[PDB]
């Protein structure tokens, strides 16, 4: 649904400039990021001998945080912040160097003599793809972190000044996806217990989670343990997955939305304890309203889903991340004290967990 | 318990002067004030043909702020300030005019030929009935705003000077009560946050109220939401209705008294959010101590209750109100940091609201 | 330069059919469209008694979007879409009706007994005159929205079928021009900020425009405010008026051309703010290249200029407009970070505005 | 104008609780803060033998940042943040200790046997007194940093719980004033030069300041040097002192107000250079509008003036300061290029400087 017109071998994406002088081919549009390493963007560019004659072609990788652009603002408020930039010359063959990777190696000996490789690496202090669009009930414009690959040809002129025509260039908007670190090791269970003293008699709530990290689509088995030693009854038990977004660059916007839930009108009277095991699966398809939450792509694109929990590297400033995504489990019990209105009291707690994509697989 | 000796038809109050020459009848003693309009004081006066012979009778409406020993002194004791005065001639029939209202119309054709009507209107820049009496622990004398209707006969003398004998006159102390208009402001909401010494986590308190205006006697459902992300524990939660009086005429006296209170009994352990819904009803009967607060009548009278929130009209000077009454909800949390004494720290916030009497039941349904 | 041979009284255009049987006269060739209302096309037709004997004459108004080789093809060449059609009978006098307007009234009593009036109105959901011709560097054929008035005579034949000879008919290609209504939106304002790689200081750009609507030829005073808190220097400041065309009927073609530009010559050193006020006037005469932009007439005609900003009426589908014209102001700053090539970075922003013709001079002052 | 009813010896402030059980005396209400050290708050409390019988009395120092309180907020938004707290027991004589300072020593042997001393010190990571009240054209509630001394008596009850009646306590709102460090050493001049190239021909502006630190009330001699090598003329020269406030705790509010100014319609045509020396003195009395700027006290109090430049100590987090005050000199030149409207172009620059109170004087 998103653009990047393929051509099969296995699956390679291409884009020609209006100029038709330069064409860019990429192995994929989504690049893996597993804390320790991050897939480099290797590919090739098909040039037109005479069209690119006299000029040179380049390819660049740029990460930028945006805020405002493409938004009905009474006073057009926009802000961009570059978090990374790297450029390489792809046309005039630099050095005797060639297809450092197999992808470009086969692509070259499959496209022609006018095919040249390029390789742009990602640093380890960059956030992953994050996007947000304020719902109607939300305040604060939309923002996000884009990763753009750009192939462009530059020629010089008499007036002693170079030119970078839009026509002779291609713009590819790739995405950086978060994947569980390779070789992690077994993980404990997310524990937690609370003691709500009502009239000094206590109402205990204990929440348990199998692992600390869950994959997108993977069911989350939440175990609730309510030990009602009070005189009141727990009329209901609500268990929902909450996503917490935190803009940390242009304006400190804040969001907490439910991306999964499962409520039940249970019954836990005095001197009685109950233990249930629910299962929730937070997905973007869960709700029709995609506004207000933090996705990894455009609200319209098909291959777009919920963003993965942010993973700030040791020693890095969180603001450099632009937007911060996190997940947790909220369990609210509706206690009932029939007398005045203590029967409305709804206590709650939360247990944090991480959400991301399946570990990477080796050859 | 308050005086104004009735006589039934439905319920009409009467008062004869010592002179027995003039008698005043009033439909009621409490007149409605719903921001947009205010019930006019219509009634009649029964005169004695020969006793009122040669002289004329009048009726007057006067609003005055007092500040001294006796808040009824119709002349002077400490400090008085007239906020309004209007007078009309009731005896010698002025014009062919007659019972402009049904009340006086039936009252006249039920009392006699010596019964004459009168009608005194209220302006829209006057405060309502407010009274205060300093408690022992209070400083500053008692004060209030009185509304007095007065029927009196005046005759002239040889020395070229008129006389207004006390005996040939009646003094009625009516009251102006506040009733809900038609539209009330937004839903009362407040949000507080605290970061204590040596702590990097917040303690949030959110207060919610159903409506912005509540009637006297109507229960106020307060919803408290404490999100304790701190290391300490909220040992207690106090919710009370506070009345704030502010004398603004002779001396800027100030008062804040609790007219209702609730101790929601449950705590909020660290790293856990709690949400409770209490219900308080501020009433005068709530406490035996009626000294120090702002009532709408005398501290002794039965039909006396708490004063309604002041409603200053647009463009009017607050000082013209004499005394200013207001209400709010105070929620204090007793946090506890076991170490030095941070365990005594008691944070608090308030959410204002309006209190008055039920909207006027005049939706055209009442066929008088 | 465009045809419609006049004849003075003030200025009236005429056209005779080859047949010489019918002649059409029009008060003008350009009709005003000010959002609320749109000038009706009134005029008269001069017929030749015997030449038009036995047959009837009509006049029709038709709005059509074309997309092909010749944007005048009254039948079909590539793609045509009728957006409106209305016809009236002008020869055999329908009803006792006559010159509903003064124009036809004087024209009739100045031409003869063979002069008959007609009046065709415009609906309020039609676009104005828009034309486009792809430049060499452009892709997508030419298109446009034509408004055609047609006077034609129809007679019948033995074979039971009517005939509409081309010879006995006239084709007038009028145009609908956009004129300011009465109220224009808020003052155009924009604010941008940039933080470049390895830099922690912001670069602010604020753009201001006097009004929201400007007339053709009227100078546009753009005020730029650059607050360079960065380490780099703004070597250049470019301010240009951009026209954005959007074909929305047969094929979604897209255009963005510069119809005005100014190179304010002054720089903004680091840690120093600068505020300049440029003035641009977007006109068709501005550039020799008229290909690729959206005009209101033929690329050759003299009285042809830039099209006015489209004004889609509330509740109407934009596609019904055929082509969409809009204007804006683009301000690009050429920052310079001497190190790798951050010195090439050219940031930019835009502020939209409306362009059209002077408000209709119909304030009751004009006594026609 | 501010309260703290004195009693002469030299000048000592007193305040009795409603309870009349405790009375607090303070040497002064404004305590000096010269980067290296900060005046400790020493004083005494006069108790009533039987009224304080059975209970103990204490005195505490507390620094807190506020935001919102006492403001017409549609949804009462308030926030308090404690930056420091220290408490001492003043009634039951702790240890054989006594008047550590002369102040309390004379005060005691001048008040009675019911007079007890106390001493509360200030840490070196606290901001000074700062207050702000948004003007009508301003957005964001009012805030500030308060320093409160509190004397209160506490007694216990049957229900096993202590009580701290409001009546038996006094609240003193002292202020921490910034004074130039003692023994600084000579300071250079605040220099700066800029080059505005118009059509490649330059227009130079150089600003000079005598010292780097100025005292409140002290005249600031600004020297402007315009070297107009351009074709246009500098029709005007504006020199103003700007105060820059920056809320850094509850919400990042921002302010820039002119607290002094001196404009002149000078004339500097092509190939000509001009050098002027203006003198501005930023004071609170300068303008009637005290709303929108950062003072050191209440907008109503007499002894209230402009806040001093913030001095963040090495290694401390600026957010801990609550509000950040700073000063600078802005010089805007109104150049005129008669042709289109280049004659409106108004260039500008700024030179920062510090503002505070006179150095401290030793015995």
Curated annotation (Swiss-Prot), chains B, C:
The modification Phosphothreonine is found at residue 230. InterPro entries: Arrestin, Arrestin-like_C, Arrestin-like_N, Arrestin_C-like, Arrestin_CS, Arrestin_N, Ig_E-set. The modification N-acetylmethionine is found at residue 1. It comes from the Eukaryota. Disulfide bonds: none annotated. Belongs to the arrestin family. This is S-arrestin.
């Amino acid at each position: 649904m998103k653009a990047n017109k393929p051509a099969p071998n296995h699956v390679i994406f291409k884009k020609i400039s209006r100029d038709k002088s330069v064409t860019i081919y990429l192995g994929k549009r989504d690049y893996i990021d597993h804390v320790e390493r991050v897939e480099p963007v290797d590919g090739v560019v098909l040039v037109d001998p005479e069209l690119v004659k006299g000029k040179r072609v380049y390819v660049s990788l740029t990460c930028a945080f945006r805020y405002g652009q493409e938004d009905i603002d009474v006073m057009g408020l926009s802000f961009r912040r570059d978090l990374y930039f790297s450029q390489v010359q792809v046309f005039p063959p630099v050095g005797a160097s060639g297809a450092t990777t197999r992808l470009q190696e086969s692509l070259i000996k499959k496209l022609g003599a006018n095919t040249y490789p390029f390789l742009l690496t990602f640093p380890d202090y960059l956030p992953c793809s994050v996007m947000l669009q304020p719902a109607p009930q939300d305040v604060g414009k939309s923002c996000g972190v884009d990763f753009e690959i750009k192939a462009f040809a530059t020629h010089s002129t008499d007036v002693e000044e170079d030119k970078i025509p839009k026509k002779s260039s291609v713009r590819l908007l790739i995405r950086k996806v978060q994947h569980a670190p390779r070789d992690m090791g077994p993980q404990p269970r997310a524990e937690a217990s609370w003691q709500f003293f009502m009239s000094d008699k206590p109402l205990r709530l204990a929440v348990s989670l199998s692992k600390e990290i869950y994959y997108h689509g993977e069911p989350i088995p939440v175990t609730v343990a309510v030990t009602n030693s009070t005189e009141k009854t727990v009329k209901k038990i609500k268990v929902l997955v909450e996503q917490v977004t935190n803009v940390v660059l242009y304006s400190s916007d804040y969001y907490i939305k439910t991306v999964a839930a499962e409520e039940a009108q249970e019954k836990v009277p005095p001197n009685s304890s109950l233990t249930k095991t629910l299962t929730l699966v937070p997905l973007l398809a869960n709700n029709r309203e995609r506004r207000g939450i933090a996705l990894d792509g455009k609200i319209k694109h098909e291959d777009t889903n919920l963003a993965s929990s942010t993973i700030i590297k040791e020693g890095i400033d969180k603001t450099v991340m632009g937007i911060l995504v996190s997940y947790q489990i909220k369990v609210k019990l509706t206690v009932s004290g029939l007398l005045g209105e203590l029967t409305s009291s709804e206590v709650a707690t939360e247990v944090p967990f991480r959400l991301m994509h399946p570990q990477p697989e080796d050859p």
